[PDB]
Amino acid sequence: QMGCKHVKGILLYGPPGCGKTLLARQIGKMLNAREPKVVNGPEILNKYVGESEANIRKLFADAEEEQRRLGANSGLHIIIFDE
Amino acid sequence: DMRNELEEMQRRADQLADESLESTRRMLQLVEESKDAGIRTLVMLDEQGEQLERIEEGMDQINKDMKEAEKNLTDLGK
Numbered sequence A: 001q002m003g004c005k006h007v008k009g010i011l012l013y014g015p016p017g018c019g020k021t022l023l024a025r026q027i028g029k030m031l032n033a034r035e036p037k038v039v040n041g042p043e044i045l046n047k048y049v050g051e052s053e054a055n056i057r058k059l060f061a062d063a064e065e066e067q068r069r070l071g072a073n074s075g076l077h078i079i080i081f082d083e
Numbered sequence B: 001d002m003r004n005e006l007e008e009m010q011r012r013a014d015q016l017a018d019e020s021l022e023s024t025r026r027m028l029q030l031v032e033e034s035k036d037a038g039i040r041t042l043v044m045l046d047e048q049g050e051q052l053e054r055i056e057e058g059m060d061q062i063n064k065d066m067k068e069a070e071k072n073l074t075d076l077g078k
């Protein structure tokens, strides 16, 4: 009835050693959802032309399919970008 | 700061063919001709087998007739 959308982003910043990765891990394990995807730094780069963008596109392929199929009854998909 | 980096492009070597369209067609034509020859040989062989089977009965009949005639003639002679 309120007709509102959901938030789709969080950013954490601060000095080293103050507990950022721990919070992300605990958030990931707090939600009854799929197994979160994890990207460790520049893990997507590739030397062939047009191959480092397909890697980006590949992360949303399950969310898009489930959204198309089940509509508004789908689950939650988490993605974690480290560094 | 003369540190350069590159990216790569790829090319596909032509697939395995361009020699499978000249000997191939001749091979197929020869196979068709051999198939036709084999069919003709089948027909001729069946006909020959039928004719041999036909010959057998006349052979047996003539053998029996000659044997019976010889036995009868011998019996009357003595």
Ligand SMILES: Nc1ncnc2c1ncn2[C@@H]1O[C@H](COP(=O)(O)OP(=O)(O)OP(=O)(O)O)[C@@H](O)[C@H]1O
Pocket: A015, A016, A017, A018, A019, A020, A021, A022, A023
């Ligand atoms: N608030 C906290 N409560 C309990 N333990 C903590 C807390 N913050 C940090 N730690 C301890 O610090 C360890 C490592 O910290 P963490 O990796 O979370 O830091 P970080 O902020 O990601 O650092 P970096 O800047 O290097 O990424 C954790 O495994 C935990 O043992």
